[PDB]
Amino acid sequence: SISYLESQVKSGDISMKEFVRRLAKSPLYRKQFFEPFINSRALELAFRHILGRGPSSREEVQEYFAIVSSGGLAALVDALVDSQEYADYFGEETVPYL
Amino acid sequence: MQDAITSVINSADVQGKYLDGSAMDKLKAYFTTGALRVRAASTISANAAAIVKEAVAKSLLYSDVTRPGGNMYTTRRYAACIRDLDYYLRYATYAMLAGDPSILDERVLNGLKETYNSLGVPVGSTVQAIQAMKEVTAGLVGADAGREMGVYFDYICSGLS
Amino acid sequence: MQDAITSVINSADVQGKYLDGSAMDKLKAYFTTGALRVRAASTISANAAAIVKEAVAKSLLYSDVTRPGGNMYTTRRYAACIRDLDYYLRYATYAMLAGDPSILDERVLNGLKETYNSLGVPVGSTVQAIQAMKEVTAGLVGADAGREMGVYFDYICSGLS
Amino acid sequence: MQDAITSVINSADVQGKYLDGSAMDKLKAYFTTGALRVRAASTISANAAAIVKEAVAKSLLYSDVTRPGGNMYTTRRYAACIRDLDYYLRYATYAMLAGDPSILDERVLNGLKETYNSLGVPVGSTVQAIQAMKEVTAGLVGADAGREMGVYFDYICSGLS
Amino acid sequence: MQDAITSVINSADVQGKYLDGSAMDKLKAYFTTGALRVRAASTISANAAAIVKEAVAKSLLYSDVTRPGGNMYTTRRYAACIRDLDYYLRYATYAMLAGDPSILDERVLNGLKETYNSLGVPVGSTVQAIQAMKEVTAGLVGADAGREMGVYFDYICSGLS
Amino acid sequence: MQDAITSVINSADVQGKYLDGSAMDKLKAYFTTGALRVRAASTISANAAAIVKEAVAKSLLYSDVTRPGGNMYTTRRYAACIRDLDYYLRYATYAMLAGDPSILDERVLNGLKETYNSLGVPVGSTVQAIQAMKEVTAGLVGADAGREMGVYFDYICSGLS
Amino acid sequence: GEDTVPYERYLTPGGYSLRQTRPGALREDVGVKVKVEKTARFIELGTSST
Amino acid sequence: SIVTKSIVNADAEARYLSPGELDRIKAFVTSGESRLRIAETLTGSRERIIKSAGDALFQKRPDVVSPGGNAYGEEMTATCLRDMDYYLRLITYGVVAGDVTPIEEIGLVGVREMYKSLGTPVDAVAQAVREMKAVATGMMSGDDAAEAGAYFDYVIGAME
Amino acid sequence: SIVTKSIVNADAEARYLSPGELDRIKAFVTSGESRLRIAETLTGSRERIIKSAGDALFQKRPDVVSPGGNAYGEEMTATCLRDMDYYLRLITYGVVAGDVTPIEEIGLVGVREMYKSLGTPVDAVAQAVREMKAVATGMMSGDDAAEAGAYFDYVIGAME
Amino acid sequence: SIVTKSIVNADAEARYLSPGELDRIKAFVTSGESRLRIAETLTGSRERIIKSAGDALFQKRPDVVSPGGNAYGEEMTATCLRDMDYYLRLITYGVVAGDVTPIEEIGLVGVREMYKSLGTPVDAVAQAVREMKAVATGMMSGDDAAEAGAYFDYVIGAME
Amino acid sequence: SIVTKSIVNADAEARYLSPGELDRIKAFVTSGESRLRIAETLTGSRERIIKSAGDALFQKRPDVVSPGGNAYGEEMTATCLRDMDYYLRLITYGVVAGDVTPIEEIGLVGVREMYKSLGTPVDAVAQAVREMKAVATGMMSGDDAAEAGAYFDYVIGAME
Amino acid sequence: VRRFRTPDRVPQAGDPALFLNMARSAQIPK
Amino acid sequence: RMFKITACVPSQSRIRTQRELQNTYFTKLVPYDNWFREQQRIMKMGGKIVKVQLATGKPGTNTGL
């Protein structure tokens, strides 16, 4: 477990969306789901873990692999959390769900 | 993902044995080659874009694949090709630093053949591009550092083919 | 493998319906164009080797691909290239006679991209060769028979690219 | 499948050039080493089963892999292991005679990693077995013939790893 | 987040000047104290839970705050208190290693007063707990390492109050 | 976010009335100026980077803010400054096309003062940079298109100040 | 036809792609062109005779 | 190890290895000889380490060997010394690798869940590694004892 | 620096500094004296480095000083030598800090966007740092030239 | 070559090289010096071979150079001499390799299909190689002419 | 060379070699190993020296390759690079001999008369040797670059 | 403590050290 | 570096999608590097930004974030 993220969420100063952002950039997630995969598979697993669905077009995979290619797991989670999609479905309080 | 040290430790642990003299000799071999690995990694980090563009200038430029109908035709396809070659050089540098090609088949060669076969990417032309990249970086860092780069470049070309 | 008649029957059967007026009109269109298809097929069967050798003389001859290093270099590769172009012209004649390109993606375009990508065959140069073959046979059989040949030649070039 | 002569001829032919002085020097090098290659091949053909059984007696015997649970446990697995080691020694002899490792990645290293990974065969233990086979045959045929055997043994171990 | 080196570089860069003799003297002071900082950090990493439990045994145990009505009453509140004290000791170790308290007001003292005031956490009792933690670790690592720990412990107590 | 048409419709709807003659005259004024707005937007889309770099070359270059200590000093700060000026020019183009500055205080001027005051960004220097950008684009697109650009540039400078 | 034992007549493109395009089995024309390897003209001009 | 950690930490960041990480790998490469000497010191005298540490542990915590404890009986005490042998082997692996990712990645992740499923007090296991650390750092020179005690320190810290 | 990078890398992982990172910080702390000597070597002879490197650059790339180039004229050549002075100062900062986070975090992040907004060829700037590296590693001993050339190498690598 | 053919022929049979095949490889290895001498004889005088053989061919078969034939015109006659140069180069390759698998495996497999697609009489090409054989075996000693005429003989035999 | 010059200078004076001239010959005899190392450095990398120096020359002096200049066209540029190859060869001879009497006595006596009869600007040839000197002294260590730059310096000085 | 041997030294089901006591207890004629 | 922002973002899509409710008007610490895309996204959804305040920055530094 990462513990200060648990503290800063239960206090409420850091929102749940920043929690998902900071936990997916955390190195437990990088050990578990970014290290044993190629970026074309880590990308789809990040789509499931953060947005709760698979990539639904080829242009989406083009766009987000270009983002992965520029800036690693950090910019991938940065671009996934800051979409219009994550903000419309989950907002600032709810955990992502499938 | 494991270097020479972690693979030696994993073999001695799967045995359940302590580190005997052969493991000590393997780790001494890695600890002698590590400084050369470090200097070659710095020299390769110096000239990433130059090695990539010289590899395209040797193999892929002025052929049919950059002409209309080729898979390297459009600017999107050219940029993705430069991206793929930068990936091959970067991961060959990582496998040179670790001294073990486990990162290559863990993170490059995992679904690469099926991806390239689904996209329509020519595998022989990209194998020739990786071979020219190997030739350029072996001209860059010398004989033996070029050889210990070319063993992982040949690993990538063998897993791709 | 299905012509215009079998595809119309398959659509009306997958519907489960009888042949209505639109199917009758489609079959009347095919039964009007069929005599022109027959005469163009005879004229193409007349001049197979001439159309193939004029396509090579237009596109592939005196370029780099017949020089050393090209994929059309050796006599084995030249004979296999003439064989591949004869295949493209023969199956384009078949798809012209059927009036449906189902034979092309059933029996030409099935594993052709992966075969050519595994061998190292340039796809753009063979697409230009098929385009010159189309230009020569459209000069041979006229305007509209050349157009109804060129639609299946463009189908082969699109599936190859 | 090509020896040093056929690879030199293939390079000069892909160039389209005649055989210049560097090709003549390469062929003179092969025609000087060929008698040593012949005598080492005869000496290795003398002691195939002895080299194989000494390699198992050095590496694989009395370890965990011949115990229950190991992949060399049963008599079927032992016979298949002796068969695999005889294959490695035979093809290393062929690559020593040709002076080119093209037969090794054409006919040994082609699908060997995927076969061994599908069966559950340990690759490190068989790499150690090939290394002990190399050590035994280099003790058999001498220093320089052992070195020109060990370059292809290292080729097999590198392609397997 | 900046150590003594990064703050010296930031001052010389905001000046736009090169590193003059006063900056060299400051960096020499840090490079003399760094080995003592390293050894004190190892000694504090040895005894994290012991220093925390001795701080609670000195200050917070057997008082009103562990009795009913206190803010350290329940097991959840006790576990969160041990967690908060482990945070204070860990970040004081980090600020001791850096030689600059920028991490403390960046990452501990940022919203800590408002969090503790919203929860109802007593600030004086936790300041006494941090003071007893400082007293215990200064008994652990000696006089001068205890002083250079206590300057950042006093920084945390001053920012909390 | 509303253009002149949507604001006229919103006024007539908040009234609950139909579109009377004054609304018709306002929409006729917008439908006369719209072609000039389109051509000025194309001309501004032509020369985005040139207008931005000429604005920096007029105001911010060779002053104290690009020297050490200035807020435009580092390459990160220079790139962020070029990004901010590109934002101002792009949104001024949008407000010129809509004919209503509602997008400017909806999406530029919303938290911009508090952001710049928290970062330490000088507001007067960026107001002078936006004024020089206005002067350059009014030299680019002419008198009246420059005026209808400068009204929204003055809106951005007034909301920033 | 009752005189010969069979032999492997056809490969798939997967198997041929496996064996031939491996680096030791590879030729050097196979996929992109190779340029001609002449010596430099200033070396050729600097010799002692045509 | 150090090289794995540096490669992964540069790998997530989509960058090459920074030169500071490179001289980190270089310094670890130079200190590998002293690491191998500490490893031979820990490997060659494992019998006396395990024996004396088990003796001092059962002297210190006698209830786990008393009837009612986990390690009561012949085979249970043998399994207890075997678990101590496992942890000394992981200590040797972490000494060679220059980092605690062998120790953590083999025998410290689910150690609480495993020893709770076995019914074992984990504090007594921490005392076992403490006595192993006492015997091992009583066996070496000063800097060698500090470098081995760092990994022993990590194991006892990861217990509690 | 090294200490910042180790603290942050342990900080995201919610753990303390591992002992391998601690001897990394210790080795950097011991090598700080040689780092300060390289820094005095680079600081005291900055005039000759900037002068000779500008001379060799304009000899190598004469089109940027020819009419039509960026650094054409008196004040433009002075600004060009000023940019080279900035990069040598960042080289000195990266030499002292033991890592490239001063160099990257000050003058390498938006360097392409800035030099594209100024109209500058970035390859000629890479040649300027190459000539600065040649003059600087011509000025020191062997290991000192290697340690300074690591950071010069990082700057030219971060250009292209 | 000889070694390729022996290796493949032992390779299908699942056996090693028989000793008779081994002294075959040994005799070819010893005769390689005379093979290289024949190759230098064929290589150094290629201009006169191609020129005189083209002259004797167009004297013998004048219809292919007459209007109506394939090799009519300047560039067509140049391409005809180029095809003869190709076949002399393959003759040199087959002389060095000791077997006709270079010649067959490069320029004799689909030669009928290629020259039928070009519109070329293959008998006139056989006459071209016949005149090349006449000029080449007029250029050497007796056993050298026999050993080169074996490969020239194979090319004319593989034509028809 | 040095020995020729000392022998001739004692020879006109009707005396033997003075002991100072003899330790001059002795010091040159001892420094011959470093001279041969500089000669191998200059010999082995002649392709890159001639290529990069021609590139930098035609970048620096574009009018001689423009139509109207001497080295305009394919064969004229090839002859220009051949003349640069000649001068690099004479540089290697002067490096080995320890004196400039090979360079002067072969390719510097009537150089003005020859290049005036060819129509060549001699200042552009001096720029060619200047770029050759830049590439060559960019290729060596410090004292090696100084010792080679002495002879490069003599060639550019003997031009003008 | 004193019965404890390292787990690598303990013989397993493939090792012939279990039958070694029988191999030294059985008599072999010269 | 982190911005302690306070904003109110109405959705304008909950009527079509019929989802349950997230409470708007949040107060959160945004990291500095992605505060950009976050402010831009709040402007994309049409929500007003009440208060932006730099929390951990110490503004005007060049290294050390």
Ligand SMILES: CCC1=C(C)/C(=C/C2=NC(=C\c3[nH]c(/C=C4\NC(=O)[C@H](C)[C@H]4CC)c(C)c3CCC(=O)O)/C(CCC(=O)O)=C2C)NC1=O
């Ligand atoms: C790394 C910087 C950092 C710190 C320090 C931090 C503290 C922090 N301490 C908290 C609670 C707490 N902190 C305490 C601590 C105390 N109360 C007492 O009576 C004692 C005097 C004192 C301990 C010495 C207690 C009892 C709670 C729980 C409050 C509750 O559950 O109602 C909470 C509430 C949320 C949660 O427990 O997990 C936070 C965010 N968060 C941070 O990010």
Ligand SMILES: CCC1=C(C)/C(=C/C2=NC(=C\c3[nH]c(/C=C4\NC(=O)[C@H](C)[C@H]4CC)c(C)c3CCC(=O)O)/C(CCC(=O)O)=C2C)NC1=O
């Ligand atoms: C880190 C391990 C890793 C690799 C290597 C990788 C490769 C990879 N290369 C791709 C595309 C590509 N790769 C190429 C490359 C080539 N085509 C050619 O003609 C040349 C022969 C060759 C370059 C030398 C091209 C042209 C595309 C684009 C295909 C398309 O856009 O249709 C794609 C398709 C999606 C996307 O472009 O962003 C992936 C996932 N992904 C990974 O995670």
Ligand SMILES: CCC1=C(C)/C(=C/C2=NC(=C\c3[nH]c(/C=C4\NC(=O)[C@H](C)[C@H]4CC)c(C)c3CCC(=O)O)/C(CCC(=O)O)=C2C)NC1=O
């Ligand atoms: C000529 C090129 C070539 C090679 C090399 C080759 C290998 C090959 N080895 C195999 C099995 C095997 N190979 C091994 C060998 C080993 N396992 C171990 O534990 C040892 C480490 C190692 C021996 C040193 C074993 C035990 C099997 C049998 C697997 C089984 O029966 O489950 C199989 C499975 C099918 C069969 O046994 O007959 C193939 C195809 N095939 C080829 O065409």
Ligand SMILES: CCC1=C(C)/C(=C/C2=NC(=C\c3[nH]c(/C=C4\NC(=O)[C@H](C)[C@H]4CC)c(C)c3CCC(=O)O)/C(CCC(=O)O)=C2C)NC1=O
């Ligand atoms: C689309 C509406 C919109 C605007 C305008 C906007 C501006 C904005 N400008 C910023 C920074 C900046 N803006 C400037 C700009 C300037 N400083 C100067 O000295 C000059 C006078 C002036 C440029 C003309 C600089 C230098 C920074 C970087 C501050 C820093 O990195 O510390 C930041 C800080 C975060 C980041 O860089 O990426 C934001 C959010 N954000 C928005 O969403």
Ligand SMILES: CCC1=C(C)/C(=C/C2=NC(=C\c3[nH]c(/C=C4\NC(=O)[C@H](C)[C@H]4CC)c(C)c3CCC(=O)O)/C(CCC(=O)O)=C2C)NC1=O
């Ligand atoms: C410490 C990090 C840092 C850098 C790098 C930096 C660069 C910087 N370079 C500038 C100009 C310049 N820099 C150059 C430099 C060059 N042009 C060439 O042709 C050469 C290749 C090259 C130098 C060798 C030139 C010519 C200008 C003037 C551009 C102009 O006037 O349009 C300016 C604008 C004027 C000023 O305020 O100085 C900045 C801010 N500022 C920084 O804070």
Ligand SMILES: CCC1=C(C)/C(=C/C2=NC(=C\c3[nH]c(/C=C4\NC(=O)[C@H](C)[C@H]4CC)c(C)c3CCC(=O)O)/C(CCC(=O)O)=C2C)NC1=O
């Ligand atoms: C190394 C194996 C090899 C061979 C043989 C080869 C032949 C070859 N011969 C060609 C043409 C030709 N070859 C001939 C040769 C002849 N016509 C005559 O009447 C004479 C009997 C005879 C020569 C003595 C002519 C006339 C053409 C031109 C055909 C045309 O223009 O239609 C061409 C087409 C143009 C080109 O790319 O060169 C090829 C590829 N290529 C090869 O790679």
Ligand SMILES: CCC1=C(C)/C(=C/C2=NC(=C\c3[nH]c(/C=C4\NC(=O)[C@H](C)[C@H]4CC)c(C)c3CCC(=O)O)/C(CCC(=O)O)=C2C)NC1=O
């Ligand atoms: C070893 C002493 C030595 C030297 C130097 C030498 C030079 C020499 N240079 C020649 C031509 C030439 N050399 C040049 C060279 C140049 N023109 C330019 O613009 C450049 C500045 C420059 C070279 C970088 C050119 C253009 C010619 C051809 C002159 C002509 O064709 O009229 C020729 C006449 C053709 C020939 O036989 O090569 C001689 C003899 N010969 C010698 O034995």
